[PDB]
Design a protein around this ligand. Structure first.
Ligand SMILES: *[C@@H]1O[C@H](CO)[C@@H](O)[C@H](O)[C@H]1NC(C)=O
Ligand SMILES: *[C@@H]1O[C@H](CO)[C@@H](O)[C@H](O)[C@H]1NC(C)=O
Ligand SMILES: *[C@@H]1O[C@H](CO)[C@@H](O)[C@H](O)[C@H]1NC(C)=O
Ligand SMILES: *[C@@H]1O[C@H](CO)[C@@H](O)[C@H](O)[C@H]1NC(C)=O
Ligand SMILES: *[C@@H]1O[C@H](CO)[C@@H](O)[C@H](O)[C@H]1NC(C)=O
Ligand SMILES: *[C@@H]1O[C@H](CO)[C@@H](O)[C@H](O)[C@H]1NC(C)=O
Ligand SMILES: *[C@@H]1O[C@H](CO)[C@@H](O)[C@H](O)[C@H]1NC(C)=O
Ligand SMILES: *[C@@H]1O[C@H](CO)[C@@H](O)[C@H](O)[C@H]1NC(C)=O
Lengths: 200, 340, 220
């Protein structure tokens, strides 16, 4: 609870999961491209080599990983365990002030269009926090199934994120419609922002 | 007193003139049974027992390993070494072993009729030795042990944990009659009365519902493993039987017109995996004639599938192969203490 | 050195099976359960099942079941996980781990992981399409532009801008596997709008596995 958590170097933080039953809870840290590492077993026991700033507690039906002083290395994903089942995962991220995305939309190049597919890209640049909603519309019909997103790693200098959403159509489909709109929702952002173009 | 462990000693009604292999081990390794065993009830004592963390079991296991390594005579033993050697047939029939404490120690015994094996126990008594326990080494089904005094008892170090083995203690035993006939020589079979078994299995299932919400209870065959555990596996008269239990765990025949005589197919194997240590052991082929033994199914080893809490069902597959759990099913109501 | 070492990267067709190994050293092999656990870019960590090396006993997750078989060889101290009838769905990183008794103290250590990607695709260089800066605005503000690096396999692709000289404002996205089984991604950059008629902007795409280099000047 919950998927991302934002904090500063040197803050105390608490990560909480909840379970019906007992017993023994464990905690894992994972870094990109690496295996999970065991931190805490039997709800509150430190695995040898793990800094004592990592504290496990368990009050019956609610158990927590506390990091008493956040270090730069501790910005990572944390999983709770209770037998076979794992928590969703909490991503600990650098806290900064709110920043609204700058929004850009790109039609497909003519060069791509020649070969029977069309990608329509929507950029949301240098925003914070990570949470954002991107909705695609085509002559005002919202689309679904036909878009993928990717997000960058938090920028190490300004702590922001960037995101692309990519609509994929057939060219047959791209050419039968006109207005192509990208609609973005974000923590102020007072109201949703739309970038669009008319094919041509 | 307080909790503590110490090397136990054994005692049995075993004879020096017997060719039988347990007797021969018992003669040089155990003493005679207590010719006047005394049990004094301790009034108003409550005591905590844990059948799952009991040094008695580790010790009984050590004995039976020693017993088997001395007794069984495979033709070929394999680990990188291959050992070829004399493998004459032996007579093999387990007897009751008792486990006793030396001076300054006593064994506490739990007499709560519905004792699951971990809780406190409110009717505690002190013995000098255990009852007589046959060291039967089977998988899936526990054979030739004691019975639960009242209801059927589910035993587990923790039931919500799917890594923990489950022990069902039946309150009514059921015959299993396995025969290799005279005289295809490795082909054999067991028989169980459809009606008793299926009655007893429906009560097991009723008991499992009490433990698991009112979650619908299903049995399935084992998902995998060595033969020793995918089949009901046991030793009759020195011969190693391997028996397919698919038809014993049939939740169609929990109306209908189905029960009859259930007959399991078996075969006698010469090449087995050794339960004691590393590798394989090849034995001589079966003796001529009727190879038979009638055993009492007295408990069941199960494992419960994981990955199922977001789901309506619990699935139970017969297991074991951790022989220590066979000892636990009889030793659960005992525990050693030290005095002062 | 208690450790677990897994076999390497797998690319399998939809329908096929994968066999992943997991080699043990530094401990008594038969004393600890092996768990398998997957990380599918989508669903955190999911336990697939456990295997007891003593006797090969297993407990598989229903969520998979039928499809996973777990076996071991006691003499080589190696465990095996076969996942059958693969789907795109099963593209993930797969981990073995040592259950210390077998959840109570565990899981430690873990294998390094094994990437499995489920695709019809074979090795292929990317097409590179310009994401042209917009003509609508601004005058003395910020314009975005980029390269769409499309329809390649396997990973990785690298993108730099103006042969390494342009690093400020660059955001090169992670690849996502497309419906078609080919990776795709964009690299973008923000530049001054007063730059657009004077400075040229070029993305440098390298896909070593196909021995493909593409350079694309991005206009206008
Ligand atoms: C055994 O009884 C104890 C105490 O009453 C309880 O904590 C435990 O859950 C029980 N175990 C089983 C398997 O019923
Ligand atoms: C202790 O064991 C006896 C059997 O001798 C049993 O019937 C009874 O439940 C127990 N006695 C008392 C006084 O609780
Ligand atoms: C087997 O059958 C019944 C169990 O109810 C009993 O009469 C007999 O003594 C049993 N033998 C054992 C457990 O060795
Ligand atoms: C065994 O226990 C079950 C409940 O678990 C009960 O219904 C049955 O009457 C008992 N059977 C005998 C023969 O005591
Ligand atoms: C066991 O074996 C055969 C069945 O093939 C039969 O002759 C005999 O009656 C059976 N014995 C018992 C005790 O059921
Ligand atoms: C047991 O018998 C069933 C019945 O067909 C069969 O499907 C299964 O493969 C057998 N199990 C073994 C050999 O463990
Ligand atoms: C289960 O119950 C009955 C009796 O044999 C029958 O419908 C079915 O064949 C049994 N299952 C088997 C043999 O796997
Ligand atoms: C179970 O007990 C009976 C009666 O003593 C015996 O004939 C049989 O061999 C025993 N079973 C095993 C598997 O040892």
């Amino acid at each position: 609870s919950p998927s991302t958590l934002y904090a500063s170097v040197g803050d105390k933080i608490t990560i909480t999961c909840r379970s019906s039953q007992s017993g023994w809870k464990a905690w894992y840290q994972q870094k990109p491209g690496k295996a999970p590492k065991l931190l805490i077993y039997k709800s509150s026991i430190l695995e040898t080599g793990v800094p004592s700033r990592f504290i496990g507690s368990d009050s019956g039906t609610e158990f927590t990983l506390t990091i008493s002083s956040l270090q730069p290395d501790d910005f990572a994903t944390y999983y709770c365990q209770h037998f076979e089942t794992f928590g969703q995962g909490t991503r600990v991220q650098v806290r900064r002030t709110v920043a609204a995305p700058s929004v850009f939309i790109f039609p497909p190049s003519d060069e791509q269009l020649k070969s029977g597919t069309a990608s329509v890209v929507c950029l949301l640049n240098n925003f914070y926090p990570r949470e954002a909603k991107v909705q695609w519309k085509v002559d005002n019909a919202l689309q679904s199934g036909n878009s993928q997103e990717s997000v960058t790693e938090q920028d190490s200098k300004d702590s922001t994120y960037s995101l692309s959403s990519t609509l994929t159509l057939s060219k047959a489909d791209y050419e039968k419609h006109k207005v192509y709109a990208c609609e973005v929702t974000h923590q102020g952002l007072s109201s949703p922002v739309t970038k669009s173009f008319n094919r041509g | 007193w307080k909790d503590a462990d110490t090397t136990l000693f054994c005692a049995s009604d075993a004879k020096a003139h017997e060719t039988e292999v347990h007797n021969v081990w018992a003669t040089h390794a155990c003493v005679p049974t207590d010719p006047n065993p005394q049990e004094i009830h301790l009034e108003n004592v409550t005591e905590n027992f844990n059948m799952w963390k009991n040094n008695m079991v580790e010790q009984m296991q050590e004995d039976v390993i020693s017993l088997w390594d001395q007794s069984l005579q495979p033709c070929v033993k394999l680990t990188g070494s291959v050992i070829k050697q004399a493998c004459p047939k032996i007579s093999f029939d387990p007897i009751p072993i008792h486990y006793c404490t030396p001076a300054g120690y006593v064994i506490l015994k739990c007499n709560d009729k519905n004792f699951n094996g971990t809780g406190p126990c409110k009717n505690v008594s002190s013995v000098q030795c255990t009852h007589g326990i046959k060291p039967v080494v089977s998988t899936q089904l526990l054979l030739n042990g004691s019975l639960a005094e009242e209801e059927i008892i589910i035993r587990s170090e923790n039931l919500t944990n799917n890594a923990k083995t489950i022990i069902v203690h039946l309150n009514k035993s059921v015959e299993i009659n396995c025969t290799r006939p005279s005289n295809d020589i490795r082909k054999a079979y067991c028989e169980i009365n459809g009606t008793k078994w299926n009655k007893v299995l429906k009560q097991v299932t009723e008991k499992l519902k009490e433990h698991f919400n009112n979650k619908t209870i299903i049995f399935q065959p084992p998902s995998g493993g060595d033969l020793e555990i995918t089949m009901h596996s046991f030793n009759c008269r020195g011969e190693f039987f391997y028996c397919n239990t698919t038809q014993l765990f049939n939740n169609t025949c929990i109306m209908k017109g189905c029960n009859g005589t259930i007959t399991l197919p078996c075969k006698i194997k010469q090449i087995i995996n050794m339960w004691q240590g590393t590798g394989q052991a090849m034995y001589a082929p079966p003796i001529d004639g009727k190879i038979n033994c009638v055993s009492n199914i007295t408990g069941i080893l199960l494992t419960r599938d994981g990955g199922a809490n977001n789901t309506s069902n619990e699935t139970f597959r017969p297991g074991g192969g951790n022989i220590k759990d066979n000892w636990r099913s009889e030793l659960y109501k005992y525990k050693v203490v030290q005095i002062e | 050195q208690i450790e677990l070492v897994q076999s390497g990267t797998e690319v399998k067709r939809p329908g096929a099976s994968v066999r992943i190994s997991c080699a043990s050293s530094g401990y008594r092999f038969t004393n600890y359960f092996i768990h398998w656990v997957r990380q599918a870019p989508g669903r955190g960590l999911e336990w697939m099942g456990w295997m007891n090396p003593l006797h090969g006993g297993v407990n598989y997750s229903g969520r998979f079941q039928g499809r996973v078989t777990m076996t071991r060889d006691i003499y080589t101290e190696t465990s095996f996980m076969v996942l059958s009838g693969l789907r795109s769905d099963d593209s993930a990183i797969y981990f073995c781990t040592r259950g210390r008794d077998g959840y109570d103290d565990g899981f430690h250590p873990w294998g390094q992981g094994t990437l499995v990607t489920v695709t019809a695709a074979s090795t292929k260089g990317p097409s590179v399409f310009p994401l042209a800066p917009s003509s609508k605005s601004t005058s003395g503000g910020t314009a975005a532009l980029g390269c769409l690096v499309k329809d390649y396999f396997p990973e990785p692709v690298t993108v730099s801008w103006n042969s390494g000289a342009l690093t400020s404002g660059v955001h090169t996205f992670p690849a996502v596997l497309q419906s078609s089984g080919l990776y795709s991604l964009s690299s973008v950059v923000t530049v001054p709008s007063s730059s657009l008629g004077t400075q040229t902007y070029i993305c440098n795409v390298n896909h070593k596995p196909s021995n493909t280099k593409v350079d694309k000047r991005v206009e206008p």
